GROMACS .gro file of C-alpha atoms in nm:
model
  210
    1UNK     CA    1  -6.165   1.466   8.408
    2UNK     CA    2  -6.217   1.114   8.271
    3UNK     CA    3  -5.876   1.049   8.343
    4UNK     CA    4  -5.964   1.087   8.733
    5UNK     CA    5  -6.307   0.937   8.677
    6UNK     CA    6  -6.182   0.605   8.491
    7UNK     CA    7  -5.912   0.593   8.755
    8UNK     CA    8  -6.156   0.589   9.021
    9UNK     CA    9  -6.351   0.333   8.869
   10UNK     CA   10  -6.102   0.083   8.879
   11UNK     CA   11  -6.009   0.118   9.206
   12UNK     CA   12  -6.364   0.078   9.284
   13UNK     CA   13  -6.313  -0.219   9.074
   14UNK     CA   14  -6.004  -0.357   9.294
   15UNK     CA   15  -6.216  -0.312   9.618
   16UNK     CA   16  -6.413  -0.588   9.518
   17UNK     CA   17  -6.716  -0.314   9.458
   18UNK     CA   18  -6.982  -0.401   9.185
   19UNK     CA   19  -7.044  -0.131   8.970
   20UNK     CA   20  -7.417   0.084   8.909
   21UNK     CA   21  -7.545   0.052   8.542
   22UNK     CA   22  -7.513   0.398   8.621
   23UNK     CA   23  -7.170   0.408   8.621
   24UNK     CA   24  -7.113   0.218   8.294
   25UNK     CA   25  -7.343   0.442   8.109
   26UNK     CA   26  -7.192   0.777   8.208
   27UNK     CA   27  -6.855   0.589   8.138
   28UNK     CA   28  -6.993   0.485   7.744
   29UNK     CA   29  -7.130   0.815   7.715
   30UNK     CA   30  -6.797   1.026   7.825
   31UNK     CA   31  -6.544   0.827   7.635
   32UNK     CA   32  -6.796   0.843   7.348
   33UNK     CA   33  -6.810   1.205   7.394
   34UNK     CA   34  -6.398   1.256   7.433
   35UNK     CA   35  -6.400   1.002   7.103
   36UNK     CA   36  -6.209   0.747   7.241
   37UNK     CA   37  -6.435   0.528   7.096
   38UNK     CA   38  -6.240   0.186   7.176
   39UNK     CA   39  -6.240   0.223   7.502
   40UNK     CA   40  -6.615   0.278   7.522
   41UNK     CA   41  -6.649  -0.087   7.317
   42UNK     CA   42  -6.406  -0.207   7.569
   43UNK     CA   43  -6.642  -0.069   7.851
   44UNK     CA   44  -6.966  -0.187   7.680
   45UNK     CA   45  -6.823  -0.545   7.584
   46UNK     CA   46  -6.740  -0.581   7.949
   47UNK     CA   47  -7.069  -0.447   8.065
   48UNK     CA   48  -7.215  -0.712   7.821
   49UNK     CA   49  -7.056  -0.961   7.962
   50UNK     CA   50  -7.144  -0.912   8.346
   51UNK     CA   51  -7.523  -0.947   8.224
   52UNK     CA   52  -7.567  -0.566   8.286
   53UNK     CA   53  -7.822  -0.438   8.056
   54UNK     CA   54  -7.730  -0.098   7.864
   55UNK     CA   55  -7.943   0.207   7.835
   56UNK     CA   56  -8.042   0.349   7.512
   57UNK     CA   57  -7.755   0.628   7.518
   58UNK     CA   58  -7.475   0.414   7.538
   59UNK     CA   59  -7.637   0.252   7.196
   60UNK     CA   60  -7.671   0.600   7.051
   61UNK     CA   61  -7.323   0.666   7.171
   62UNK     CA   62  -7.149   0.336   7.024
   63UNK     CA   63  -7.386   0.351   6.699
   64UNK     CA   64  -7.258   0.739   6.658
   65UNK     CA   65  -6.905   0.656   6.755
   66UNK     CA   66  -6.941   0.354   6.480
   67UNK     CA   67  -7.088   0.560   6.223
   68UNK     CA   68  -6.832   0.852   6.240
   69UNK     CA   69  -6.552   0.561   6.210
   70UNK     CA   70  -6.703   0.411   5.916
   71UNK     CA   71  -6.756   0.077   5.996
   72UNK     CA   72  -7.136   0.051   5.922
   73UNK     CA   73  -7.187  -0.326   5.969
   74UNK     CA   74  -7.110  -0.344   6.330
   75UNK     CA   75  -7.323  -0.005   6.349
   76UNK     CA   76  -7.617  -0.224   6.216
   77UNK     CA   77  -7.580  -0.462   6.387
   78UNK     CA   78  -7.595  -0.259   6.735
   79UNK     CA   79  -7.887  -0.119   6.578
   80UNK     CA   80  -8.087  -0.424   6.569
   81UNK     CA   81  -7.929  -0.574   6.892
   82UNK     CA   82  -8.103  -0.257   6.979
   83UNK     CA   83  -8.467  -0.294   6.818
   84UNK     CA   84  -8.495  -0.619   6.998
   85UNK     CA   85  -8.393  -0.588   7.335
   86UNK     CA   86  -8.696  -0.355   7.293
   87UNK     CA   87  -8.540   0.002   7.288
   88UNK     CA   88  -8.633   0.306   7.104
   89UNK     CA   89  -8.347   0.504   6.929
   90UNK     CA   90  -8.369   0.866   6.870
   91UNK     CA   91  -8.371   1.092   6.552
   92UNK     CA   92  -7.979   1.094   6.591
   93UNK     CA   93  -7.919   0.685   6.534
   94UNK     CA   94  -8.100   0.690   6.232
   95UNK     CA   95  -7.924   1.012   6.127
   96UNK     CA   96  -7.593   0.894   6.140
   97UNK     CA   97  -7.719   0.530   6.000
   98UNK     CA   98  -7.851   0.697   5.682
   99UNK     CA   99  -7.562   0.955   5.671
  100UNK     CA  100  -7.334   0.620   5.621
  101UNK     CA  101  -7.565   0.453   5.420
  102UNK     CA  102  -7.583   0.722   5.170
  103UNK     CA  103  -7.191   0.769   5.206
  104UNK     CA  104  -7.136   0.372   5.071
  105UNK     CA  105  -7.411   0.380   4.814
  106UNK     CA  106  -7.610   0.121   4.966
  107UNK     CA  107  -7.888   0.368   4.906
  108UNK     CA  108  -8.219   0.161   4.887
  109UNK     CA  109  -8.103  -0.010   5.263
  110UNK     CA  110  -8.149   0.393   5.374
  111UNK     CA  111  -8.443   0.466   5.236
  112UNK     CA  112  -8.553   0.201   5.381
  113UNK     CA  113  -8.479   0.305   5.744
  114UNK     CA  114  -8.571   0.662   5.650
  115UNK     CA  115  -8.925   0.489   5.567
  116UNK     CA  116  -8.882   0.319   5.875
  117UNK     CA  117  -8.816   0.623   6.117
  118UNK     CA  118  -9.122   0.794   5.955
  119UNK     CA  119  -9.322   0.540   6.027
  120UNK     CA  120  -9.248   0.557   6.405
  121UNK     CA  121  -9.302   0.957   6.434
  122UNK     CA  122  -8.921   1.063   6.410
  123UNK     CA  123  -8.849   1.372   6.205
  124UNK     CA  124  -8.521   1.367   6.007
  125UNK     CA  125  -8.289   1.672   5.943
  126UNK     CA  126  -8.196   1.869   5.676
  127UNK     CA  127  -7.883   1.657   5.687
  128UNK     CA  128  -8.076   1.327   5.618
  129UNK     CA  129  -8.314   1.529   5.329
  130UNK     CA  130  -7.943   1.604   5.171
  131UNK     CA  131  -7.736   1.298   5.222
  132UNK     CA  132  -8.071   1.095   5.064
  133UNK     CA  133  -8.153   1.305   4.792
  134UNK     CA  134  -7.769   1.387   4.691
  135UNK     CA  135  -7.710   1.029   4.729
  136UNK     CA  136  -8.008   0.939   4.485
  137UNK     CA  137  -7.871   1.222   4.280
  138UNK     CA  138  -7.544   1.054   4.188
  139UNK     CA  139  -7.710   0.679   4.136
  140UNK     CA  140  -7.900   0.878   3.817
  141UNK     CA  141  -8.212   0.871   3.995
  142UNK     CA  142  -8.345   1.221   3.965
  143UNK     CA  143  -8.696   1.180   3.969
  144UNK     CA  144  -8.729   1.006   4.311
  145UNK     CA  145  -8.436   1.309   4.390
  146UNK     CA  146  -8.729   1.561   4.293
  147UNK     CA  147  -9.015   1.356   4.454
  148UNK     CA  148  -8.806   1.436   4.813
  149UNK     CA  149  -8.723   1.757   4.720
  150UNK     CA  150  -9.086   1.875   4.689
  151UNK     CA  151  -9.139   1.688   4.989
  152UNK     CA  152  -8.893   1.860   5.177
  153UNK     CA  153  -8.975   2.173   5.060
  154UNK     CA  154  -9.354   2.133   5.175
  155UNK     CA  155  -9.219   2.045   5.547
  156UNK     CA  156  -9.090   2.379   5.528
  157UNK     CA  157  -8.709   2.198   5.543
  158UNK     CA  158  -8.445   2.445   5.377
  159UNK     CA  159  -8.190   2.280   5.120
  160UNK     CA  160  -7.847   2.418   5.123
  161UNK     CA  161  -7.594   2.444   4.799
  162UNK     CA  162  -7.499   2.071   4.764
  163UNK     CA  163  -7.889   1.984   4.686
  164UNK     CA  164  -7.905   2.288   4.467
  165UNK     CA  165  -7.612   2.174   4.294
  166UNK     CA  166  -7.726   1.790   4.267
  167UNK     CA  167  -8.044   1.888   4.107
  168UNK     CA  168  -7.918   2.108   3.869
  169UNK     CA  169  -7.675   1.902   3.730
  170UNK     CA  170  -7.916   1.673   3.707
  171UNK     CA  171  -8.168   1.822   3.534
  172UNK     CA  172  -7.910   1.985   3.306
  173UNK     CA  173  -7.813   1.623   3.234
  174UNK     CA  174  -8.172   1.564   3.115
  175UNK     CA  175  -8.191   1.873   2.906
  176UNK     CA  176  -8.416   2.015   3.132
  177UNK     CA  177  -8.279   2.379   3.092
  178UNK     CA  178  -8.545   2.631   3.196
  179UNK     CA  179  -8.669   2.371   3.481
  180UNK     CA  180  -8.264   2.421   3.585
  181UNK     CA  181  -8.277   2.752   3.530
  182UNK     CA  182  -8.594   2.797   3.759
  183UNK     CA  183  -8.385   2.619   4.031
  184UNK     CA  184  -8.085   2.853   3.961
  185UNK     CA  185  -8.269   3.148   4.042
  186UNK     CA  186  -8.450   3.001   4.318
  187UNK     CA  187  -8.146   2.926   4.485
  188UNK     CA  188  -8.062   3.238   4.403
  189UNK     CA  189  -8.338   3.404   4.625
  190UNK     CA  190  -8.227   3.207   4.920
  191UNK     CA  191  -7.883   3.373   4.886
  192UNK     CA  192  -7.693   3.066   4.861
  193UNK     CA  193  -7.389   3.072   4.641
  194UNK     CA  194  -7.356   2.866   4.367
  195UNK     CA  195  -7.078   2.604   4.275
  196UNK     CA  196  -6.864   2.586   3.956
  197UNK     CA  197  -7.054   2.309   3.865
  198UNK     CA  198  -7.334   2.488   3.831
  199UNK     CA  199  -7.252   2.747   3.601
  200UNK     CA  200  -7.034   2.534   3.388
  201UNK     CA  201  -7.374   2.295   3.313
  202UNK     CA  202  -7.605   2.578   3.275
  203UNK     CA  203  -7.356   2.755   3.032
  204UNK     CA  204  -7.311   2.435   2.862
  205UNK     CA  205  -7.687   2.397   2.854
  206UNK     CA  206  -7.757   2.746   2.724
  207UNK     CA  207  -7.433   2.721   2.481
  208UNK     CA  208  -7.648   2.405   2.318
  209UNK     CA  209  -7.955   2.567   2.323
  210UNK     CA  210  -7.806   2.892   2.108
   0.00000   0.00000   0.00000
């Protein structure tokens, strides 16, 4: 119905009718929703410009929209628009922000804002555990990989097959076998099934070993 909605708002529009923040919001949030993303930024760039101040969903909104599309740069920079015109994002902002982050290697920048967010009380998903820690997998960096995946495992988080996978090729890398092999079996009690990659490393390892 945002056909009918949008429709109606620009007739309100022609009336000579000033919109409610209101409005704009629920706007932002249902475009952002129905991911027509560009016409949200068209909405929001508009609602910008008549000095109406934006609520903290249409941020989370744009910054999701952003991060889904790829272009992380203008994400940040809503982000920090954001921190200084004083609002507080949600778990899901830094989510995504990480999630990209992690996707274009720029790995340090999202530990930093996962540093960040745990500073101000949020608590991050399994998603952000596995996007930093199979990120910092495939930079070489397996001990800080290890560090969070005790970590995780102590705040009772559950790792699915790609972190399973990322360590133990890893660790097989290292010619950590039996440490591997611990992980292969403990994956195994979790009932997760295993990838090719696996195997082929810890066959390789063993193969090696005897």
């Amino acid at each position: 119905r945002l056909e009918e909605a949008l429709e109606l708002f620009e007739e309100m529009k022609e009336k000579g009718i000033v919109p409610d923040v209101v409005t704009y919001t629920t706007l932002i949030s249902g475009l952002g929703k129905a991911g027509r993303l560009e016409e949200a930024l068209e909405l929001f760039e508009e609602m910008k410009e008549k000095g109406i101040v934006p609520d903290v969903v249409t941020y989370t909104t744009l910054i999701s929209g952003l991060g889904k599309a790829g272009r992380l740069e203008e994400a940040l920079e809503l982000f920090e628009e954001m921190k200084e015109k004083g609002i507080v994002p949600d778990v899901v902002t830094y989510t995504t922000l990480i999630s990209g982050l992690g996707k274009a290697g720029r790995l340090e920048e999202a530990l930093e804002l996962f540093e960040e967010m745990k500073e101000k009380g949020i608590v991050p998903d399994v998603v952000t555990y596995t996007t930093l820690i199979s990120g910092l997998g495939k930079a070489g960096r397996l001990e800080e990989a290890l560090e969070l995946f005790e970590e995780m495992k102590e705040k009772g988080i559950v790792p699915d097959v790609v972190t399973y996978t990322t360590l133990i090729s890893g660790l097989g890398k290292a010619g950590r076998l039996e440490e591997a092999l611990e992980l292969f079996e403990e994956m195994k009690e979790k009932g997760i099934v295993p990838d090719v990659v696996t195997y082929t490393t810890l066959i390789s390892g063993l193969g090696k070993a005897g």
